[model samples]
Target: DVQCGGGFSCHDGETCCPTSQTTWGCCPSPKAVCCDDMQHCCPAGYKCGPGGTCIS
Candidate 1:
């Protein structure tokens, strides 16, 4: 997503997750779930866990 800001961007079907200011982490799934800490992500149809885990 362009919202990652600066010159960062994600590929199609990837989720644009913010890792920090002006930086991003790519979650390689559409509609991925971003964790509250803004450093981890879960794939689609799953919930975010404590350590970048994807829970059913």
Candidate 2:
């Protein structure tokens, strides 16, 4: 249920990408990311990962 105009959108394969103006294309799907990638795509409770698997 990701938002299209919000900070996140529904990406194919349960993957979501942040659509923020200040931060873009930094976050990937699966709710298991671990790195910031310099973009604020990471939500408050999520982190970027090396394998692109938004892990907890």
Best by lDDT: 1
List where candidate 2 sits over 4 angstroms from the true fold: 4-8, 17-21, 26-29, 37-56
TM-score of each: 0.60, 0.28
How many backbone clashes does every candidate have?
Answer: 0, 12
For model 2, how does the per-residue alpha-carbon lDDT over 1-56 read when each residue is reduced to its tens digit? 54545554565554444444544353444563424464334444665577654444
Please list the C-alpha lDDT of all candidates, in the order they appear.
Answer: 0.69, 0.48
Q: For model 1, which pairs clash?
A: none
Q: Give the TM-score of candidate 2.
A: 0.28
lDDT of 1 by residue, 1-56 (tens): 34445667876666787766667787767777777565677777888766556679
Superposed Cα deviation of residue 19, candidate 2 (Å): 9.0
